[PDB]
Each structure stands twice: as structure tokens, then as C-alpha cells.
Design a protein around this ligand. Structure first.
Ligand SMILES: Cc1cc2nc3c(=O)[nH]c(=O)nc-3n(C[C@H](O)[C@H](O)[C@H](O)COP(=O)(O)OP(=O)(O)OC[C@H]3O[C@@H](n4cnc5c(N)ncnc54)[C@H](O)[C@@H]3O)c2cc1C
Ligand SMILES: Cc1cc2nc3c(=O)[nH]c(=O)nc-3n(C[C@H](O)[C@H](O)[C@H](O)COP(=O)(O)OP(=O)(O)OC[C@H]3O[C@@H](n4cnc5c(N)ncnc54)[C@H](O)[C@@H]3O)c2cc1C
Ligand SMILES: NC(=O)c1ccc[n+]([C@@H]2O[C@H](COP(=O)([O-])OP(=O)(O)OC[C@H]3O[C@@H](n4cnc5c(N)ncnc54)[C@H](OP(=O)(O)O)[C@@H]3O)[C@@H](O)[C@H]2O)c1
Ligand SMILES: NC(=O)c1ccc[n+]([C@@H]2O[C@H](COP(=O)([O-])OP(=O)(O)OC[C@H]3O[C@@H](n4cnc5c(N)ncnc54)[C@H](OP(=O)(O)O)[C@@H]3O)[C@@H](O)[C@H]2O)c1
Lengths: 303, 303
């Protein structure tokens, strides 16, 4: 009944859907939340070719805008599973079932947790995984950011609009982030560093975070310091629960594809951050997306 | 002396250069003409995520704009060869030589010729490979477009702004172009079709094209019809002469890479239309580009 169903309307899925529709495939794009995925949790995007800078949510809007006019069927759905029935597949949401000849999985990735005490307890209360969502709640605080990669360092620079200071805690003596972002963090006066450290505990009164305990990973020295907010940016986990049974994920849960975005399962493709890969960006999400769209077109042509 | 040299400033090369520079690689971007590559020969771009529609040359400008500010070294150069010297490489232009630790080849593809009589003769004179360049020269003419793929059909729709009529000649009974583009050509009143045919000869007086002779590929019937212009869009050839000796091309001249954009030759990567692949688009040029940039960064880190 559908030629293609695409799960997830971040930039990879939205690009796929734009292509399947231009190919006049009967196209359903399922999204559990707001179109844009992670781009909506991004303050400022500087490295998407075509725009010198653009707010995450504006880029999200621009990419979603033409889909309806192309005849993409945009629907709300949280997908809970996928059943393969050889010459077709069933996708199960909370309420519905959807029959399709092919699937492009574009469900991305989610924040990795610290799994330390106080992290859950203070979830609503000074612990955040999204600077653009929560930063203004921490005006004039001492903010802590945990992590050393592009999200930690970039989101720390953003958080300097709000905090008295922002401190980046990284578990080595060298950041992983892009040099230009590093260099911008080195130079920014409101950014402090706690190198070679990991957090051990988040502590607070009954209402909110007050301090963090942390350990130096070369000496074992333990320190506790006061902070009003903690943003955690220590990497990503796949968002692929609905396919765990299917034999298409690696040991860590990422979807395995070949270079044409194909899983084991004919007619089931995956794109973007959810795939097992190293280089997660909007550019590679968009490319993966277009590639999947084309492979699905071909797959459906042969069916 | 360079960490990376990128040859070609179309969207693939310009994306690569934006990434190498953000990685603070000492970056040279060589281009023989105007930044934008094929996008400059494109009238209207509708399928680049982020823009609902945008003129080829405007998208070119936007992608070129931030490169200087990132510290990309933008230079004029036509590259004639590349010499590998193990731990470095030499790139030869017409006038200069450039030493670099890595190369990202992003030189794209060029129009395939018909190789029929009158095609060279009337080159300046009613034969064109670029509708956006020459279309207005053919106001009120009967225009012919040869080809059945996305460029023929899309450039024919554009040419309808200028011609009395535009006729698409395709060598089968089914277009290769995207269905949406087909459907738009079917519906457009100024677009005629000559199906199942190939052109045999382009004829003219001393000053210009007047007619085309063509053959039906199922019956052998030969017909000659009057036209004032002919646009030829019958596919692409690689632009990779400077590496022919190097053992990195297939029998047709396309550069062979793996999925991380690597050739045989360590430190020599290729991206975009110049690679051996099937799916040539701005989205996949941009993705390939970002991927190469990252692989080059890593390659140079290990050197
Ligand atoms: C703070 C931050 C800043 C970033 N900045 C940049 C940047 O500047 N440049 C850059 O190139 N990259 C950036 N990235 C990375 C980039 O945003 C991602 O690589 C990209 O968004 C991946 O797109 P995707 O479509 O694969 O996944 P996502 O954007 O993660 O989209 C996945 C979508 O699937 C939906 N979903 C998940 N599960 C289900 C389900 N079961 N059913 C229905 N829907 C589901 C989600 O709601 C989501 O909308 C940044 C990331 C972060 C966190
Ligand atoms: C008419 C037309 C319309 C199109 N429309 C679309 C569209 O709507 N959407 C879409 O996604 N795709 C479209 N495409 C395809 C798209 O433009 C290409 O896939 C894309 O431009 C490839 O980019 P690239 O950087 O790999 O190569 P190119 O854009 O071809 O750039 C290669 C660059 O290398 C330079 N160069 C070549 N040799 C040398 C040398 N020896 N030394 C120095 N410089 C050199 C050239 O000057 C050129 O600037 C279209 C193509 C055409 C012809
Ligand atoms: N502008 C952009 O292009 C942009 C922006 C944001 C994200 N992204 C991309 O998105 C993907 C994910 O980015 P990310 O930064 O969220 O994740 P990431 O690249 O996995 O980096 C997470 C960082 O946190 C560190 N870390 C892990 N556990 C830690 C702990 N317990 N304490 C302190 N530090 C810890 C890691 O250490 P190690 O480094 O030692 O492993 C790493 O530096 C990447 O591919 C990234 O490039 C891109
Ligand atoms: N909007 C876009 O996304 C866009 C726009 C333009 C180009 N592109 C991409 O650019 C790449 C190249 O596009 P293209 O259209 O230039 O080339 P193409 O896809 O190779 O198509 C060339 C077309 O011309 C036909 N042909 C070849 N020789 C012929 C002859 N002698 N007489 C009549 N017809 C002949 C081919 O026939 P067969 O079909 O029988 O082989 C084919 O249909 C493609 O990957 C394309 O998708 C994309």
C-alpha cells in the first residue's frame, strides 16, 4: 500500500522523502515529534553548505517546508516495531499499522547518559542534555558541560550567552571537537576547562543541583565543585529499538548498512546518524538520505 | 607545505574545503573557472534540502562565500597532473607546482558529445550544451533537446521560456528523468517528444544550424526536421585527465574509491561526480565532500 515509509523526519529522512516523492513513490514520512530531529536542538549551524549560519530550527523548517507540496504524506507516529513479510513489511506504531514495500529508517541517535548518581534525580532540576532548550534557565549560573566533542564544545560556546561561566570537563587533555571550535573555546573568556576528568556524582538539595564530584583520570584526585547547571554531551546512542529482533544492528545497536544504505533485509534501508558509522553530520545525513531514496526507488521498481 | 589540496570548487570541493579548513588544515582550493561547477550551468535547483528553489549561480555563491573567512586559500589553477612522491604529492598546473600531503579530487564531469556530423561545425552556431548559458539566443526558435535524463528534461522545461517549442528526442520510449520532471514535461504544452530516436546529423547553411536528421531505433526510419537550436544532454564523461597514468580510474575514466572516498593511493581521495558512481547530485556531492575532508584530516594526522 506504501511504496516507501520513512521513519524519522530529521535531515536524513526529510531528504529521502523529498527524493522518493520526486520519484512519485507513494511516500509516508513518520515522525514522533517535530521535524528537524537534532537540528532543532542546535543553536547555530555554520557548516551546512548553502548557509553561512542558520539557527537549527530555521534550517528544520526550510527542509520540511516543501514536503507536503511534493505529496509526501506527513504523519505523526512513534514506531514500536517492524515486521518483515517478504514481499512487504509492516510498521507498527502505538496506534496504527502500515503496510509498505520498503522502509527507510532515519531515526537518528540520542544522548548517552553518564549513569552516575544524581543524574536522574536532578533531571528536571539542573541536569540537561540540550543547551538550546534549557540554557536561558541558567542565567548568571556557573554552568558545567561534560564532554570534549563537537557538541560539548559548541554548546558550551552557546551557553556563554547565559552563564557567568561555562566549564568544559573532558576526560582527556585534548578535545575531539573541530579545531576551529576548540580555538574558539580556548579564546573565549567565559570558558574554563577541567581537563583529564570525569564526573562521579551530581549533588543537590531537594530542589536542585548544587555541586559535582569528579575524578582526575591520571591521578585519581577527587574534587567537588559548585555548579548551578550541568549539560552532558558525552556521545550518542542509536535510536533503533523497533528493529532489535531483526538481525540488522551491531553489538552497540547501530544499524549496519552497505554503501548503498542497504541492511540484510531487502527493502529495508537505513540512513544518517542511526547507521553504524563515525562521521555524523547534516551533510552526510542528507547524502545518505538521497542515496537510500534512490536505492528504494530501484528496489520497488524491481518488485 | 599544504595539508590538503582540493581540485575543483563545485559543491563537492567547496564542502570539502569548508571541512578541512574548520579542521584547521592548511588548505588550497584550486579552480579553473568560476566556483559552483555544474550548479552554475543549472537554471533552477529544487531538490537541495534547505532551499525550496534557488538559481544555480546563487547557490554557488552561497557555498563559496564563507570559504575565504575560514582561511581556505582560493586560487585559480587548471591542473594538468599529479605526481605521487610517497610522503607527499605534487600537483602541476599550467604555471605552478604545489606540494601537499593529501589531495581531494573534485573535478566533476563534463558533457558527453554526440560525435555526429555538424556537431563541431555548428558549436558556436546553434549547438549548445548549456541551456542557462545560451537559451535566450534562441528566442522564438524551435529548439531541440537530445537526451532523456534529468538534464535533458529539466533543461527542456527551462528552455520553454524562450522557444516557440522545445522538442525532446530520446532514444527509448521511457524517460530516465525523475517522474516529477517527466510529468511536468508531459503536461507542458510547449514540449514535444520524438521518442525512440537518435540524431544522425546536424545540418546548417554556413552561418547556422537549420535541421537535424534522425533515426528511429526500432524501425530504422530516417527523418529530417527543421530546428534553430540543439541542446545536447546525453550524459557525462569524467574530468580526470591529470590522473590517467596513476592507476586510479576505471576503463571509462571515472575515479574508483571506496566508501570513505579513498583511491589506491594513500592521501589521494576523490569526491562527487568524478567518482565512479551512479547517483550524481548536489546532495551526494556535498556528502562525499564532507567524508573526504574527514578522511584527509585523519590521514594527515597519522603522517
Ligand atoms: C547540539 C548539536 C549540534 C549539532 N550541530 C551540527 C552542525 O552544526 N552541523 C552538522 O552537520 N551536524 C550537527 N549535529 C549533528 C546533526 O544534527 C545530525 O548528524 C543530524 O541531525 C542527523 O540527522 P538524522 O536525520 O540521521 O537523525 P536526527 O536528526 O536525529 O532525526 C531523527 C528523527 O527520528 C525521530 N524518531 C526517533 N525514533 C523514532 C520512532 N521510533 N518513530 C518516529 N520517529 C522517531 C526523532 O524524533 C528525530 O526527529 C549536531 C548535533 C547536536 C546534538
Ligand atoms: C543542467 C544541470 C542541472 C542540474 N541540476 C541539479 C539539481 O537540480 N540537483 C542536483 O542535486 N543536481 C543537479 N545537477 C548535478 C549536480 O550539479 C552535480 O552532481 C554536482 O554539481 C557535482 O558537483 P562536483 O563538485 O562533484 O562537480 P562539479 O560541480 O562538476 O565541479 C567540478 C569543478 O572542477 C573544475 N575543474 C575541472 N577540472 C579541473 C582542473 N583540471 N583544474 C581545476 N579545476 C577543474 C570545474 O571548473 C568545476 O568547477 C545538475 C547538472 C546539470 C548539468
Ligand atoms: N558542527 C558539527 O559538525 C557537529 C556538532 C555537534 C555534533 N556533531 C557530530 O555529532 C556526533 C556526536 O557528537 P558528540 O560531541 O555529541 O559526541 P562524541 O563525538 O562521541 O564526543 C563525546 C565526547 O565526550 C567525551 N566523553 C565521553 N564520556 C565522557 C565522560 N564520562 N566524561 C568526560 N568526557 C566524556 C568523549 O571522550 P573521547 O573524546 O575521549 O572519546 C568525547 O570527546 C559526532 O560525529 C560529531 O562530529 C557535529
Ligand atoms: N535534478 C537533478 O537532480 C538533476 C538534474 C540534472 C542532472 N542530474 C544528475 O546528473 C547525472 C547526469 O544527468 P544527465 O541527464 O545529464 O545524464 P544521464 O542520466 O546519463 O542521461 C542521459 C540520457 O540521454 C540518453 N541518451 C544517450 N545517448 C543518446 C542519444 N544518442 N540520443 C538520444 N538520447 C540519448 C540516455 O539514454 P538511456 O536513458 O537509454 O541511457 C539518457 O536517458 C544523473 O546522475 C542525473 O540524475 C540530476
Amino acid at each position: 500500500k506504501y511504496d516507501v515509509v520513512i521513519i524519522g523526519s530529521g535531515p536524513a529522512g526529510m531528504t529521502a522523502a523529498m527524493y522518493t516523492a520526486r520519484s512519485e513513490m507513494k511516500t509516508l514520512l513518520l515522525e514522533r515529534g517535530v521535524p528537524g530531529g537534532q537540528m532543532n536542538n542546535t543553536a547555530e549551524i555554520e557548516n551546512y553548505p548553502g548557509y553561512e549560519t542558520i539557527m537549527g530550527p530555521e534550517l528544520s523548517m526550510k527542509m520540511a517546508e516543501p514536503l507536503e507540496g511534493l505529496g509526501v504524506e506527513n504523519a505523526y507516529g512513534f514506531v514500536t516495531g517492524i515486521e518483515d513479510h517478504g514481499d512487504y513489511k509492516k510498521i507498527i506504531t502505538e496506534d496504527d499499522e502500515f503496510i509498505t514495500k520498503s522502509i527507510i529508517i532515519a531515526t537518528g541517535a540520542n544522548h548517552r547518559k553518564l549513569e552516575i548518581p544524581g543524574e536522574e534525580e536532578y533531571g528536571a532540576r539542573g541536569v540537561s542534555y540540550c543547551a538550546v532548550c534549557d540554557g536561558a534557565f541558567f542565567r548568571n549560573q556557573e554552568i558545567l558541560v561534560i564532554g570534549g566533542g563537537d557538541s560539548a564544545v559548541e554548546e558550551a560556546l552557546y551557553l556563554t550567552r547565559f552563564g557567568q561561566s561555562v566549564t568544559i570537563m573532558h576526560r582527556r587533555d585534548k578535545l575531539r571537537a573541530q579545531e576551529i571550535i576548540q580555538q574558539r573555546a580556548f579564546k573565549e573568556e567565559k570558558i574554563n576547562f577541567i581537563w583529564d576528568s570525569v564526573p562521579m556524582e551530581i549533588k543537590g538539595d531537594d530542589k536542585k543541583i548544587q555541586s559535582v564530584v569528579y575524578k582526575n583520570v591520571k591521578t585519581g584526585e577527587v574534587t567537588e565543585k559548585a555548579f548551578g547547571g550541568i549539560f552532558i554531551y558525552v556521545g550518542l546512542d542509536p535510536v533503533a529499538e523497533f528493529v532489535s529482533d531483526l538481525g540488522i544492528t551491531d553489538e552497540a545497536g547501530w544499524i549496519i548498512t552497505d554503501d548503498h544504505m542497504r541492511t540484510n533485509i531487502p527493502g529495508i534501508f537505513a540512513v544518517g546518524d542511526v547507521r553504524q558509522k563515525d562521521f555524523r553530520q547534516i551533510t552526510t545525513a542528507v547524502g545518505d538520505g538521497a542515496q537510500a531514496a534512490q536505492e528504494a526507488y530501484k528496489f520497488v521498481v524491481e518488485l
